Amino acid sequence: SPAPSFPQDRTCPYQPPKAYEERRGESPLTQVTLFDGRPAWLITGHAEGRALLVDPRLSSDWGHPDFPVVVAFPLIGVDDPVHARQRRMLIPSFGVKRMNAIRPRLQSLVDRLLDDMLAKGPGADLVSAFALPVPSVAICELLGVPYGDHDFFEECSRNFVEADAAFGELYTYLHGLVGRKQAEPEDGLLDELIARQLEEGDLDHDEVVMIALVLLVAGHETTVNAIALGALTLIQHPEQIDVLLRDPGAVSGVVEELLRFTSVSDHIVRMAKEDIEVGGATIKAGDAVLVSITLMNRDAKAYENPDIFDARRNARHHVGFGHGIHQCLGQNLARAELEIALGGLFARIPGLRLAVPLDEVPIKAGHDAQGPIELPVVWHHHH
Numbered sequence: 001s002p003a004p005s006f007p008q009d010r011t012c013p014y015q016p017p018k019a020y021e022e023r024r025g026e027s028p029l030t031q032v033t034l035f036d037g038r039p040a041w042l043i044t045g046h047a048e049g050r051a052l053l054v055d056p057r058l059s060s061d062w063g064h065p066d067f068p069v070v071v072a073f074p075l076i077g078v079d080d081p082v083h084a085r086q087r088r089m090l091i092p093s094f095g096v097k098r099m100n101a102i103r104p105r106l107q108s109l110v111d112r113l114l115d116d117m118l119a120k121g122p123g124a125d126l127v128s129a130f131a132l133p134v135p136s137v138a139i140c141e142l143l144g145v146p147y148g149d150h151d152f153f154e155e156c157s158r159n160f161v162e163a164d165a166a167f168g169e170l171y172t173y174l175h176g177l178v179g180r181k182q183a184e185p186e187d188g189l190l191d192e193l194i195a196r197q198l199e200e201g202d203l204d205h206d207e208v209v210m211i212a213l214v215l216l217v218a219g220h221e222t223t224v225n226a227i228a229l230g231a232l233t234l235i236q237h238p239e240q241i242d243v244l245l246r247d248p249g250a251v252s253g254v255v256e257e258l259l260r261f262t263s264v265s266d267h268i269v270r271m272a273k274e275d276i277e278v279g280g281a282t283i284k285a286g287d288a289v290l291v292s293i294t295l296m297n298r299d300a301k302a303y304e305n306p307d308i309f310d311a312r313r314n315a316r317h318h319v320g321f322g323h324g325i326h327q328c329l330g331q332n333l334a335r336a337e338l339e340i341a342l343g344g345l346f347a348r349i350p351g352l353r354l355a356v357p358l359d360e361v362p363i364k365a366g367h368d369a370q371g372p373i374e375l376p377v378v379w380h381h382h383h
């Protein structure tokens with residue numbers, strides 16, 4: 001593409017910009033241009049994207065001098081062998097048993113947020129009143145943050161999602177927490193990771209803090225958007241709100257279709273390490289490769305009528321959580337947050353509606369995780 005063309009902003013909060021669907025060819029990948037003129041491949045085919053995302057030839061090394069920027073981090077910003085070591089230290093903390101202990105806390109939090117919303121009502125900004133606190137507290141419970149420090153932690157987290165004093169405040173708190181936990185172990189991912197490091201066996205104090213900070217950054221804003229834009233999508237599709245009021249398996253199916261349709265992480269970034277033949281093209285070593293989660297999830301070859309939101313469709317292999325080497329580690333926590341927050345919101349406020357026309361909802365730009373900056377809602381009944 002001769003002039004910078006990626007990214008482009010959404011105009012509809014839960015549809016990709018026209019220019020992205022126009023950029024899609026018959027081919028499963030096309031080409032765009034980043035802000036400084038760098039060419040990049042855009043992967044749009046659902047099947048080819050999955051194939052490429054398990055492929056070791058695509059790097060995520062953010063420390064490489066030529067790593068693409070669209071305009072430093074454990075896990076998400078490294079290749080093997082650092083990647084596999086950090087991730088295998090974490091996997092056992094995201095187990096079924098830890099999730100299920102997190103569930104009733106998210107339940108109790110969601111009820112409280114809803115009582116409070118209703119006490120102040122109507123309406124509310126659903127981002128501020130509801131989507132914003134949930135991922136915060138989920139991360140506190142995940143990490144094992146002393147319950148005494150939750151308000152502080154949420155507050156920091158909220159200030160973050162300029163703002164690089166929030167991020168530094170979290171660093172310094174976490175740095176101290178890590179030290180306190182090493183000398184007096186408690187319960188939580190921090191403790192587990194500390195014990196896992198020590199196993200091996202010198203503790204890397206800054207790496208533990210950075211991993212904790214990556215978990216927070218990766219898991220906070222995207223989940224906030226997935227809650228808020230998920231609610232927006234349902235408000236705009238009131239003929240399907242009932243699916244949320246049926247059994248837990250229907251709730252989980254709504255959650256999967258929202259992940260696919262809304263594609264809150266819209267693209268992820270890679271760099272080729274070697275030549276790759278894909279889809280009639282030859283990606284060369286050093287080439288920027290953007291993987292479009294949005295256009296993959298709207299690929300008609302994978303999903304019949306892909307631009308329709310259908311809460312009952314089979315959405316099993318969506319890439320809303322990515323795929324392969326770096327696919328979302330916190331995905332089962334996020335699913336829990338979404339099921340409990342969306343199911344609780346519509347159970348309590350099934351007539352929840354927008355207080356503003358759709359086209360007045362402010363939404364994030366194209367380089368960002370996708371979703372509303374604010375979400376003015378009102379209701380005139382609640383259960």
Ligand code: HEM
Pocket residue numbers: 060075076077087142214215216218219220222223226264265268269293319320321322323325326327328329330331333334335
């Ligand atoms: C609905 C909410 C979420 C969405 C849509 C989402 C989406 C994604 C996507 C698309 C990736 C792939 C990144 C890549 O391939 O470059 C990813 C990775 C990651 N996510 Fe999530 N995520 C969510 C929530 C969370 C939560 C709650 C956590 C933490 C508890 C988390 C932690 C991570 C981590 C650590 C990675 C990197 C894993 C690795 O590099 O091996 N995410 N996420």
